[PDB]
Amino acid sequence: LKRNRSHGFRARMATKNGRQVLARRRALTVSK
Amino acid sequence: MELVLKDAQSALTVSETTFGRDFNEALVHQVVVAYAAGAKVNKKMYRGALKSILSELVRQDRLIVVEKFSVEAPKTKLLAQKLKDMALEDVLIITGELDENLFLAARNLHKVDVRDATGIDPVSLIAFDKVVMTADAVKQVEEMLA
RNA sequence: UAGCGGCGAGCGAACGGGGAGCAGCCCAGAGCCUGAAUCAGUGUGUGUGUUAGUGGAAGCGUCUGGAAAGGCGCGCGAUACAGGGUGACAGCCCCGUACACAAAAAUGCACAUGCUGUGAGCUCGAUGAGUAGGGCGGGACACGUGGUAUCCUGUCUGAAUAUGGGGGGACCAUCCUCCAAGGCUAAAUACUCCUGACUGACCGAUAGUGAACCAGUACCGUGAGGGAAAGGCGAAAAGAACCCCGGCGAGGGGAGUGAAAAAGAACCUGAAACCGUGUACGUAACUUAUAUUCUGUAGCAAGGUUAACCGAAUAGGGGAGCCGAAGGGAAACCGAGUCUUAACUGGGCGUUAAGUUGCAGGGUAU
């Protein structure tokens, strides 16, 4: 639950660092 | 009607309108069903059912009254010996002020329960066929039941 | 309910009563003496927890049985008949149950103690200043900037210090309330990620959280995301020592452990669609609840009922509502009669025609 939200794509999008990490990986860590 | 004590026959006068009235089966059944479901109850009908059940118990000769029922010391052995002398096993002890020794040495008795006048409930009275009631509790129950 | 709504669908008040609590102060400025109230910090004391833990009462015989925890008898314990485990159902076999208790060390809770910080308190000033109000253009509910009625202003103005100024539906006579234009607030009042305990006339592997199982796993998509299937040997593996047939395989067939092997690891119980063996027969899916109404039953009875509240608490205190009473007419007003009418035998409504709360159920829409 916490991983699904805290580490979920929503939380990463809410943070600039999360968006940067997701973009870097696309060029992952949560699978619900 | 004067309750039988078996030792002194010193029972005090009891209002027949309260402890000796007609048994209303429907009211008693309704009250016991409501109590079981809860475990709306109205004061007047509840008191009427209590009076009816008390009248039924006294008219069935299942109620015994003594001057003072208690135990010298808080020991279950003394209570067991007293019950054996009385030659009774399933008895509901009802009194006034909460006895200390008896209440302490009465929990383990599966078939014997002790309660005060304010704590009387239809379930407790119906559960045990025989009731031992303290003499001083007559006025308390009369005022409680109006 | 009043009210609102092309008064159609529908939305939605105030006052008051009774409970937990009910705390008002600070300064805006002067003095008197005065850090003596209260709050935090710091070392100590006492009582209570917690973070590990201690003691803790009572029994056997016979018979049935794989094991007795089944029941038969005679005994005892109990301030402890809450529970769990032991070869089948345990107050007396074990952990525990009531009770008595327990801390070298830390913190939390209450105060006292020496000290450091805000710092008793008494009297007398005193109103929170560009304030109420006004003008141009804007932003919010109707403005779509003026229904502008309310709020704020980019900007120009603007006489009040308990003489005076605010409101009270006009102002007003009676008068009710405060000194606004500076700040604080703690109690009762909701929520539960997660922790301790208590349970449930809760669910039983196709139920229950998606997951009783190494489940947010395999897998499906580059990603968001979606998301499964899968428990049961037994009492102790006591897991079949050991002879032989087989390929030093597997598989089974014997003995043995075993209550049971109809418990043998593809491990409790076993039914059909499915395939054979042996025998006989003829045959070429309107759920919960507010309202409407009805049925039968119980208490009291002109009373029944008390509710959020308190309650050694489902008992009892707490009449505020809650249906009616000797009535009705819109009112006056009269009184068993009354009402527009001079009056209708007009005609309507009444005469002391008793009502209420629960119980189980039937129809309607919401």
CATH classification of the domain holding B90:
3.40.1370.10
Protein A2 CA to nucleic acid C51 C1', in Å?
29
Cα distance between residue B82 and residue A15, in whole Å: 80
Residue type, B107: R
Question: At residue B93, what is the residue type?
Answer: I
Tell me the residue range of the domain where B22 lies: 2-145
Unique residue bearing structure tokens 């308390």: B140
**How far, in Å, CA of B30 to CA of B46, rounded?**
10
User: DSSP readout, B23-75?
Assistant: --HHHHHHHHHHHHHH----HHHHHHHHHHHHHHHHHTT-EEEES----SSS-
Instruction: Specify whether the backbone of B9 is left (phi greater than 0), alpha (psi in -120 to 50) or beta.
Output: left
**Residue B27 · residue B96 · CB < 8 Å:** no
CB atoms within 10 A of CB B14: 19
Contacting residues for B81 by C-beta, under 8 A, at least 6 apart: none
Which nucleotide does the CA of B29 lie closest to, via C1'? C298
Looking at domain A1-32, its CATH class is mainly alpha
Chain breaks in chain B (C to N over 2.5 A) after: 39
Angstrom distance (rounded) from CA B88 to CA B66 = 14
Q: How far apart are CA B69 and CA B136, in angstroms?
A: 10
- Laid out side by side, the sheet with B130-134 consists of B63-66, B130-134, B91-95, B113-116
Round and report the angstrom distance from CA (B31) to C1' (C274).
Answer: 62
Distance B46 CA to C65 C1' (A): 54
How was this one solved?
cryo-EM
Q: At B87, is the secondary structure helix, strand, or coil?
A: coil
Q: How many separate domains does chain B show? A: 1
- Segment holding B93, helix H or strand E: strand B91-95
Q: What tokens were used for A24?
A: 């870097």
Measured distance CA(A6)–CA(A12) in Å, rounded: 8
Q: Which nucleotide is nearest to B101 (CA to C1')?
A: C79
CA dihedral B71, B76, B79, B81 (to 10 degrees): -130
- Which bases of strand C sit closer than 7 A to a protein CB? 77-82, 201, 210, 216-227, 297-300, 304-306, 312-317, 357-360
Integer distance in angstroms from CA B108 to C1' C65?
A: 33
Count CB atoms within 10 A of the CB of residue B38: 8
- Rounded CA gap, B93 and B125, in Å? 10
> Domain-by-domain residue ranges, chain A?
1-32
- Secondary structure (3-state) at B141: helix
